[PDB]
Amino acid sequence: NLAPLPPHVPEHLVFDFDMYNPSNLSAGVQEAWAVLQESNVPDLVWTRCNGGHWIATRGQLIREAYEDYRHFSSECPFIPREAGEAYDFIPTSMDPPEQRQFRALANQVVGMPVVDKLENRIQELACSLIESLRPQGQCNFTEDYAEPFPIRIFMLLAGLPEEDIPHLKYLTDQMTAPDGSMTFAEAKEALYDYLIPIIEQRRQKPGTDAISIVANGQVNGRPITSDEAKRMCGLLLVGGLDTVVNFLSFSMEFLAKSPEHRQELIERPERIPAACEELLRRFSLVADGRILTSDYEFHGVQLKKGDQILLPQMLSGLDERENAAPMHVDFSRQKVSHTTFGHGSHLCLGQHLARREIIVTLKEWLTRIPDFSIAPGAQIQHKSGIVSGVQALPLVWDPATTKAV
């Protein structure tokens, strides 16, 4: 299903990469995308897949374009165009200067002071889950830990009842790696539908939860509207229910397959914060994009107004020009270069919450279940898209090797 080459796009720059189903997906998704950085591939290519779009394949260009919001607008960040056009989440669908007032408000509800405040709860949720799993000697890591640990933290943060988790998790899945049950726009509207009545309840009775704070915030010298609160809370939901969930699985799949890396963190726990950055580089998983606001020549390439450009956050840290032996995981790597949380004015607001969840997971899992591996006869399957992920991760261990601290 290829779209015909637009007239202004030179055919010598075509490389038909499919972001929702890469060729080498069997070898791992970061591997599958890494083909965009083979010797023969230009720094900037055009794929005719998914409606047709540009792809920057190197961190230098990826960074540059994320810095230049004049030319590369986040007004239409999702591929395909239909999704990107429907996309109106706040702050992501906004450029500076308009973006910054809304980003300050969102930073209030997931930024570092919130995270510090939630440290003991994060720790308790991890411990509770792991202690419950520990004697079993096995789990599906994605649905037994990777999903409920971040999601319960987020529901706590947002003041939303855990009974709603199955509903909301289903909706977020479909905006990110769509099956076909519902379009991006349909999944987005359903999430908006969930939120509106909750926002209205909390505007009148102002509280401490993320939704109350947003709903009662002030932007550009006026109260925020219900419609604006909704567009912002919907986005926070997506971040809290999907991306960290999928990153934890990549990291745990790797640790499960690499006893020596588990051992290094067990033996030298002080390296865990540095280890968290090197996993974030290696198992980077996001890829959205921008849309051209005007005709623009970018690195010798003529981009036209309305062109979409995929700027894969994933690829910058896998670029051998920024990190030697990029596919190798080295916890003592001297300068870990990545853009896993993005680059420019949309730099992930959740990054401090994410790092805490990752670091607490590494610490608590490895303290209690130091020895584990992939279940016998299992092959791990990755999924690709805006946010790539792990389909399933069956783990096993001898409960006699486990610890209660």
Ligand code: HEM
């Ligand atoms: C490993 C975990 C995570 C990764 C890799 C990640 C990745 C990213 C990336 C690449 C962006 C920028 C997208 C762009 O420039 O268009 C972003 C933005 C954002 N993230 Fe995350 N994320 C993670 C976790 C979280 C969490 C836990 C939250 C909590 C709510 C969150 C909330 C947000 C929000 C609100 C934005 C929009 C910022 C803006 O547009 O100004 N994220 N993330």
Ligand SMILES: CC1(C)[C@@H]2CC[C@@]1(C)C(=O)C2
């Ligand atoms: C691309 C993102 C990671 C960023 C936060 C959630 C996400 C899917 C968005 O829609 C904006």
Ligand SMILES: [C-]#N
């Ligand atoms: C961010 N997700």
Ligand SMILES: [K+]
């Ligand atoms: K849009």
